[PDB]
Amino acid sequence: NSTATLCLGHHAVPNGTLVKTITDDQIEVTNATELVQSSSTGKICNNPHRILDGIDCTLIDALLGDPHCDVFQNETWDLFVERSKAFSNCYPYDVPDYASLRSLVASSGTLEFITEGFTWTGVTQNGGSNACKRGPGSGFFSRLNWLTKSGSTYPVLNVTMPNNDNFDKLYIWGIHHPSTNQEQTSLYVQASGRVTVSTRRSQQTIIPNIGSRPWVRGLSSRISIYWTIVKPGDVLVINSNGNLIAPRGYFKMRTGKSSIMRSDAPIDTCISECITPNGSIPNDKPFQNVNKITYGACPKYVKQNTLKLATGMRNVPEKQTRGLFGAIAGFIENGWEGMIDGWYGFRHQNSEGTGQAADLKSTQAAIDQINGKLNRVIEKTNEKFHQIEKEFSEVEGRIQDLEKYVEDTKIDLWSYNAELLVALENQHTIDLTDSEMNKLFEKTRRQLRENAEEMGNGCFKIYHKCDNACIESIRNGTYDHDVYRDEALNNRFQ
Amino acid sequence: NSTATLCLGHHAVPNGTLVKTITDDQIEVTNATELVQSSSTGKICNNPHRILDGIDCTLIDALLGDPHCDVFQNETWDLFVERSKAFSNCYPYDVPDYASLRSLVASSGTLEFITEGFTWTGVTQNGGSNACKRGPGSGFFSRLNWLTKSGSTYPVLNVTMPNNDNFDKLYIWGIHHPSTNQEQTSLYVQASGRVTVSTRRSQQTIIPNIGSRPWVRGLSSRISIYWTIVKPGDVLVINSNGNLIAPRGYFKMRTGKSSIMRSDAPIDTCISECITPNGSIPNDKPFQNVNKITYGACPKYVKQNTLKLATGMRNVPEKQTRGLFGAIAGFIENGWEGMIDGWYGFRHQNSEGTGQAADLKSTQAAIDQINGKLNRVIEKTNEKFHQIEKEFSEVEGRIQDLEKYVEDTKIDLWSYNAELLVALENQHTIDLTDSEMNKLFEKTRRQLRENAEEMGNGCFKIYHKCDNACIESIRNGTYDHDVYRDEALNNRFQ
Amino acid sequence: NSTATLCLGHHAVPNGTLVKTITDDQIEVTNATELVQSSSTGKICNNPHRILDGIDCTLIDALLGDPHCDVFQNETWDLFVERSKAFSNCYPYDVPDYASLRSLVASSGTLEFITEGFTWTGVTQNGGSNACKRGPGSGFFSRLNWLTKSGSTYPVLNVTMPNNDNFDKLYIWGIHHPSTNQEQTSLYVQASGRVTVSTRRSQQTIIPNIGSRPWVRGLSSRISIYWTIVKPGDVLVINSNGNLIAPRGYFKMRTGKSSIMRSDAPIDTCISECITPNGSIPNDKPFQNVNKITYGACPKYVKQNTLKLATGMRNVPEKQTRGLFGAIAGFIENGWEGMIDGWYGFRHQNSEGTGQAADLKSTQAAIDQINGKLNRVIEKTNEKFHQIEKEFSEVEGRIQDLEKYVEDTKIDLWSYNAELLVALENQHTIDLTDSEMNKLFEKTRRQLRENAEEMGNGCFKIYHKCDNACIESIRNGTYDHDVYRDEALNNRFQ
Ligand SMILES: *[C@@H]1O[C@H](CO)[C@@H](O[C@@H]2O[C@H](CO)[C@@H](O[C@@H]3O[C@H](CO[C@H]4O[C@H](CO)[C@@H](O)[C@H](O)[C@@H]4O)[C@@H](O)[C@H](O[C@H]4O[C@H](CO)[C@@H](O)[C@H](O)[C@@H]4O)[C@@H]3O)[C@H](O)[C@H]2NC(C)=O)[C@H](O)[C@H]1NC(C)=O
Ligand SMILES: *[C@@H]1O[C@H](CO)[C@@H](O[C@@H]2O[C@H](CO)[C@@H](O[C@@H]3O[C@H](CO[C@H]4O[C@H](CO)[C@@H](O)[C@H](O)[C@@H]4O)[C@@H](O)[C@H](O[C@H]4O[C@H](CO)[C@@H](O)[C@H](O)[C@@H]4O)[C@@H]3O)[C@H](O)[C@H]2NC(C)=O)[C@H](O)[C@H]1NC(C)=O
Ligand SMILES: *[C@@H]1O[C@H](CO)[C@@H](O[C@@H]2O[C@H](CO)[C@@H](O[C@@H]3O[C@H](CO[C@H]4O[C@H](CO)[C@@H](O)[C@H](O)[C@@H]4O)[C@@H](O)[C@H](O[C@H]4O[C@H](CO)[C@@H](O)[C@H](O)[C@@H]4O)[C@@H]3O)[C@H](O)[C@H]2NC(C)=O)[C@H](O)[C@H]1NC(C)=O
Ligand SMILES: *[C@@H]1O[C@H](CO[C@@H]2O[C@@H](C)[C@@H](O)[C@@H](O)[C@@H]2O)[C@@H](O[C@@H]2O[C@H](CO)[C@@H](O[C@@H]3O[C@H](CO)[C@@H](O)[C@H](O)[C@@H]3O)[C@H](O)[C@H]2NC(C)=O)[C@H](O)[C@H]1NC(C)=O
Ligand SMILES: *[C@@H]1O[C@H](CO[C@@H]2O[C@@H](C)[C@@H](O)[C@@H](O)[C@@H]2O)[C@@H](O[C@@H]2O[C@H](CO)[C@@H](O[C@@H]3O[C@H](CO)[C@@H](O)[C@H](O)[C@@H]3O)[C@H](O)[C@H]2NC(C)=O)[C@H](O)[C@H]1NC(C)=O
Ligand SMILES: *[C@@H]1O[C@H](CO[C@@H]2O[C@@H](C)[C@@H](O)[C@@H](O)[C@@H]2O)[C@@H](O[C@@H]2O[C@H](CO)[C@@H](O[C@@H]3O[C@H](CO)[C@@H](O)[C@H](O)[C@@H]3O)[C@H](O)[C@H]2NC(C)=O)[C@H](O)[C@H]1NC(C)=O
Ligand SMILES: *[C@@H]1O[C@H](CO)[C@@H](O[C@@H]2O[C@H](CO)[C@@H](O[C@@H]3O[C@H](CO)[C@@H](O)[C@H](O)[C@@H]3O)[C@H](O)[C@H]2NC(C)=O)[C@H](O)[C@H]1NC(C)=O
Ligand SMILES: *[C@@H]1O[C@H](CO)[C@@H](O[C@@H]2O[C@H](CO)[C@@H](O[C@@H]3O[C@H](CO)[C@@H](O)[C@H](O)[C@@H]3O)[C@H](O)[C@H]2NC(C)=O)[C@H](O)[C@H]1NC(C)=O
Ligand SMILES: *[C@@H]1O[C@H](CO)[C@@H](O[C@@H]2O[C@H](CO)[C@@H](O[C@@H]3O[C@H](CO)[C@@H](O)[C@H](O)[C@@H]3O)[C@H](O)[C@H]2NC(C)=O)[C@H](O)[C@H]1NC(C)=O
Ligand SMILES: *[C@@H]1O[C@H](CO)[C@@H](O[C@@H]2O[C@H](CO)[C@@H](O)[C@H](O)[C@H]2NC(C)=O)[C@H](O)[C@H]1NC(C)=O
Ligand SMILES: *[C@@H]1O[C@H](CO)[C@@H](O[C@@H]2O[C@H](CO)[C@@H](O)[C@H](O)[C@H]2NC(C)=O)[C@H](O)[C@H]1NC(C)=O
Ligand SMILES: *[C@@H]1O[C@H](CO)[C@@H](O[C@@H]2O[C@H](CO)[C@@H](O)[C@H](O)[C@H]2NC(C)=O)[C@H](O)[C@H]1NC(C)=O
Ligand SMILES: *[C@@H]1O[C@H](CO)[C@@H](O)[C@H](O)[C@H]1NC(C)=O
Ligand SMILES: *[C@@H]1O[C@H](CO)[C@@H](O)[C@H](O)[C@H]1NC(C)=O
């Protein structure tokens, strides 16, 4: 008739997702993303990090030079992958502080070996065994030299090697533990051995232990592996009177990003920055629930399987009660499921007809704030390489308990941080979208000084004759109240 | 007279509690809970966890089989409790890596012992001492076998025991350290002993040390305790030429939730899930300030003695200035101390009389949001069992420094998390209660289109004749402005 | 003319600082502080902590009593400072568990030495060497006693020392490692040494190692340093048959706040509570980016170089478009750069003239909330003394990896806490300043019931004749609407 109705509202959707905030345990929204990566392809991608697959070789057999591990000489890696089908097929051995040696060689990232001229005098070199067959003949570790009595004598050995280079040199050496008192004299003339290996600042002395051990590949004897690092400017001395497994050369040492991982996943051709023991995962999401062990740029490990970030507004599903008069309704009531052009918009009822449109500035302002919110506080990426061990096969006691306690403390503190951040950010999102709605209302109310009244459905009963051009002026922000003031005041108050 | 007054407000209380928020260091509220448990009954509750009280026995004397500890054979526990009055009354001994053995046996949770048929040949078994009297006679540890020379000989001993079962076997053994060179030959024919104990993958060799030590229970000699774990499929070999304290059998090994705690509190009949060394505490509150050492489902340890969570709204104490005309006042002014039915409510001044009532929907909405707020972010419970040691009696150096540094880092990071969460949640509570108040006001203002005006005390001067039925209609949400519009407009503007 | 204009606004500045919030990556403010200390004077301040500068002495040479370190006898410290130019000039030595001994002596905080009467019988005391010249003569460590054969004999030594005091006693002792089999017999008659040192509860036995090592100051022989702690009530026994470096007395042991730091900064006269290896830094700011190593009350280490806390409101720079009519504009439009008396204020356009003033209560309320905000959640100070090592010169393996992993976990968790707190607090600051603005508006609107209208520039077109006294009444809070109601209603609606 003589008056007009102009209402404000926001878009609704039929199928919405539940989220969690500070104030409510579940609310419904128009749209929500996932922030926890729960899946893996099950394969290890070979770019961009250099992957070296050990097949039946451990890293400690590859370094000593076991015969089925001779493909690995002078190799380099970013990540070394060990398989659970790996075995040993040479002289039986133990390494005191095995975990320490494995970690030191993994972080160096190379098996570069330089043969040096060591002069062993009055002894027979290149000792062998049928526990280590290289071809039909007997053999031994390619990087160690078994020394034994020449004629009926083993002289006190005294050799020196100086570092005049500008890098560090790692020497691997050992000692033979014979099973009887009748084997010692047969190989090394003496009855009790001794091996001393020293620099200017450090020393180690080992004595051999004699007695019977379980049979492994036809022997009840064992070797024990040791190591020494010689710095630039320092000297090495070796002084043994019996039972010495001599070094043949040194290994170069580098500082870099190299590491080691126990996996059973196949290796494939693809590009992925994060590797887990369950295969490579993508790094688009900030958190991950696949595995606590990782390498390269990776998401943070949390205990949760799902965290949903509200990327839209609240979803009051349109009351399916469609008015008989098709009464335009507002935001205080419900959402509008018939709006596609934008989030916030205007519906006008006029003599001319019913109509609809969308507001660009309001929608854009909400979208710009919402895009990249998580990016503001937590970092895009976090690269880590060589870390600690997080899974154990044996019981050890104190140090293993401390390692397990340090990892659990870290996981519980990053899981609490991930729960609070999603609830805080979800709250702030619902608040900014709701204030934006009420901001367009106050703007509309301010332009209509005394020529409109509020109904409380989210609607402004305008008390003059508004045509399409007049509605368009309000929408734009050029509505001139003075023109229709007299007519509206005479219509509303009399 | 011809007009009416309708005011909105919220309840006040006389005695209120101070809280802390992001924005203010102290604010007064109607009601507040405590979140830090500061007290204990001083007793250890025997349900639901199985408590085994050691009386004068340590866990390492119970395992070796000291005579005053024979009540403990084949025992099982969830928590083992050690007392400060505990002592030793057998052969004097030391355990290298004592802390490691104590932690391994505590997490297993049993003293199940299976005697095995070991054949010691050419030696005299069941050696004894008057430092360990079981009855009037001499005695020894019930689980160890002291072996000595038969006639004038001690043969090289070589025995083997295979694991064909499907579980792990823990063997405890040792070595005797005699005080002179004249005692060695007297017991074991040789002048220098040796004990080797090996599997397929591991070995240990110990040599004995001779010399004088302080007198303990009439002896200057000592025993040293060692241990070996044999996995399913593996073998054990023992090869000693002198000074062997032989094993008698193995201990079963389990993986579970068992642990050990040093306390002096009495044990009583009651049900409590959390145990501390100061007695059992309840687990209703999220944080605790009693002790950093804990077992079972327990609250998190923080440094603070008090953290108060606002469970009510702000408390503007009713200005005791009671108006002479008894002028109804609103929320912008003060609180209402005369309201019991609900938090938010209406007071009406009419020709009929003064009156009061309460609003249910508004009060319920505030209460539902406030109930269970903390439950949304922090977890209800956190069960932990075997952890690290947090109190030390000796100085050790590096490892102890790292253990103390790891615990302090955890406490400072959980104390900062507990301070921020209470301040954040308290802020959000005050905000939601204040917005709820302003929401009922806008609802009231919207229903009274042009028949009422705002005074600014929190009151609506209605400009027609409102009776009890009219006030009731506003309160309900069925007020029909059109009926009194003409009368009110003629009364207010002319 | 017949009407008046009264507008509300807030102060603007020309040069503003960008900050970061939850909702926006950069916003402009009137004023902002820095919270990260990035600079140091480069000197170590000598008050209030007692600094003891080692010059060419390490703490382990000062304790043994090397000749160039005799100024350090009976010294005490809170912090001991080691220099990179330090060297050794006595008998060459190694300490097994060197890191453990250095940490134990540093936390005690004294070199107090009590000479005790030990009776060495049948041996020659005060052995010497030209590797340690004290004057022209040969010399040795001042706190150790080299013992050697008297005539042609070295008796088995058996001595005892009881603790009857009420404090702990630290004894430092050692063993000589000779380079040949011809040097052993020459000094100590036997061919193989032994040193046993025991209490009632503990024992250590060391055997000497013979062989050649690199030359240091004309010797191929070395000493190995050991230690024992004897508690109140306990006894010490020493039982050596050769190669004993005997103790001369004990060191007192204290529990306190003492520590050690490797620095190269000069020591100066000034007062500073926090010391770093880059010199003393002030502790006014909560975070610091100078160094992860610290001593005393210090700010927390974070990875960031800058974190800016908004201490003012938002800065909408005054549109330099100055109205031709000099139209007073409000807050919805821009800020006011012409206001110095306060933040929030009123500008009045009247027949009398244009004018300006400031509101005290509103400005004060905002300032009081903003002052000390950070103080509410994070603690003013955090004192720490003896901690762990955070920089290493050698590769060691497992324990060093765990130490490095524990420090990185702590740094990443405190850097995430510092990023979120600044973004949260900055958001809350912008919100409280903006609500304060809208609170003065509603107060102004409420006082002008029907005698004013809103324009939407932040202005109230008052529809009567307002003079300076009338404007002053509004500003005060004594404006009486009734007086001008009839005139304003006849002017605005007709
Ligand atoms: C101290 O005590 C230990 C433990 O008792 C002794 O160690 C044992 O020594 C014997 C003799 O060396 C070892 O016996 C050998 O076992 C080999 C492996 O056996 C496996 O494979 C065979 C074939 O499949 C199976 O039958 C068997 O069950 C195992 O699965 C055998 O292959 C060896 O065979 C040799 O002898 C036979 C004789 O018939 C010949 O036909 C062969 O050609 C070959 O020469 C042999 O039987 C035994 O394994 C050791 N046990 C362990 C676990 O260590 C020490 O000998 C003892 N030392 C001293 C000094 O007393
Ligand atoms: C190397 O050096 C060490 C240290 O000097 C020597 O060790 C000492 O050896 C002697 C002899 O074995 C020990 O003496 C014994 O002490 C026992 C405990 O004494 C406590 O209780 C008594 C009674 O209450 C108190 O008087 C005393 O103050 C203590 O509180 C005594 O009970 C023993 O008594 C025996 O001898 C007496 C003689 O009168 C008889 O009446 C008794 O029946 C009994 O046979 C005895 O006196 C002494 O404790 C050791 N000290 C320590 C601390 O070890 C080594 O002997 C020495 N070794 C060599 C090889 O030289
Ligand atoms: C086992 O094997 C080791 C390693 O080979 C041997 O150790 C070497 O032993 C020799 C002899 O003791 C050491 O030689 C000595 O070196 C001293 C230091 O040399 C430095 O300074 C000089 C002078 O500036 C430089 O020329 C040199 O390059 C070094 O920078 C010399 O000062 C000693 O001099 C002595 O002899 C000379 C002879 O001309 C006299 O003039 C002097 O007065 C003085 O008496 C001497 O040359 C050598 O350093 C050892 N090397 C290492 C690194 O240990 C063991 O001897 C050997 N042991 C056995 C038992 O076989
Ligand atoms: C493993 O690597 C070593 C070291 O070689 C270095 O590392 C490799 C991975 C490559 O990057 C090389 O380019 C790099 O130099 C190899 O040692 C090398 O061995 C050869 C043969 O013994 C040496 O050649 C000798 O040179 C001398 C003259 O100096 C002649 O007298 C000899 O007749 C002979 O030609 C070469 O110098 C040496 N390189 C060194 C020491 O750097 C090693 O062969 C290699 N092994 C395998 C299996 O690949
Ligand atoms: C400690 O426990 C062991 C092992 O017994 C097992 O653990 C207990 C806590 C209970 O749960 C038992 O049900 C469980 O089996 C006891 O060992 C047992 O000892 C007895 C007596 O030596 C064995 O009986 C023998 O059986 C053989 C036939 O196999 C006969 O020839 C013998 O004459 C005799 O009857 C029994 O088999 C054995 N159980 C085993 C090995 O599992 C042990 O006695 C017990 N000690 C105490 C003090 O309670
Ligand atoms: C290092 O310190 C010790 C211990 O002295 C104590 O610590 C100091 C830092 C000061 O605070 C002292 O006040 C404190 O006591 C010194 O030991 C002392 O040595 C002297 C000389 O040998 C002892 O005096 C003797 O006393 C006896 C009688 O008991 C007489 O028979 C002797 O003739 C002689 O006068 C003094 O008792 C002793 N103090 C003790 C044991 O506490 C030490 O001299 C000192 N060294 C240096 C270089 O300063
Ligand atoms: C990625 O690989 C890891 C293994 O490296 C997978 O974790 C493993 O998941 C299984 C199934 O949940 C766990 O088995 C269960 O163990 C418990 C405790 O022993 C037992 O009670 C159950 O009956 C069952 O055997 C297994 O323990 C677990 N391994 C570890 C060490 O956590 C993980 O599921 C894989 N993830 C993906 C996404 O593929
Ligand atoms: C629960 O039991 C623990 C002990 O297991 C109690 O902690 C102890 O409290 C006392 C009193 O505060 C502390 O004593 C003080 O120690 C300091 C530092 O040495 C000293 O300067 C004081 O003079 C006083 O002796 C004691 O150290 C502390 N023990 C520990 C290891 O923290 C605790 O109070 C008990 N709590 C409850 C609620 O019962
Ligand atoms: C306070 O002193 C510390 C040293 O104790 C200073 O840290 C050092 O800063 C320099 C320059 O950034 C670092 O050098 C660089 O190291 C990297 C990695 O090796 C290398 O790639 C670069 O080429 C360069 O050499 C040095 O490593 C670093 N030291 C440590 C251990 O962090 C610090 O800058 C000083 N701070 C102030 C405020 O004076
Ligand atoms: C909900 O908002 C998210 C924003 O993360 C939209 O997510 C994108 O959806 C498309 C669909 O093809 C994906 O290809 C993109 O990778 C998503 N992310 C980005 C980077 O835009 C999602 O489309 C929105 N959902 C609806 C229904 O609009
Ligand atoms: C303040 O609110 C708390 C909510 O925690 C009320 O606390 C309850 O008080 C009763 C009093 O008998 C206890 O028995 C309950 O255990 C408390 N908790 C629960 C679970 O309801 C408290 O009553 C309120 N105070 C006032 C004055 O109303
Ligand atoms: C911005 O607010 C800060 C509050 O931290 C003001 O900082 C003070 O500035 C004076 C300038 O002489 C310093 O001496 C003080 O140490 C600062 N802190 C305190 C404790 O007041 C700063 O002045 C303000 N800036 C402006 C332009 O007003
Ligand atoms: C208000 O609503 C109640 C039902 O909740 C009803 O009993 C009462 O009659 C209503 N009062 C009116 C319409 O005045
Ligand atoms: C406003 O209040 C002040 C006191 O703060 C007073 O001096 C002044 O006269 C008052 N002005 C009025 C009522 O116009």
Author numbering:
A (entry chain C), B (entry chain A), C (entry chain B): 8 to 501
Q: What does the article say, verbatim?
A:
Hemagglutinin (HA) is the receptor binding and membrane fusion glycoprotein of influenza virus. HA is synthesized as a precursor, HA0, that is proteolytically cleaved during virus replication into the two disulphide-linked components of infectious virus hemagglutinin, HA1 and HA2 (1–4). Nevertheless, cleavage is essential for fusion activity. It generates the HA2 N terminus at a conserved hydrophobic sequence, which is called the fusion peptide because its synthetic peptide analogs have membrane fusion activity.
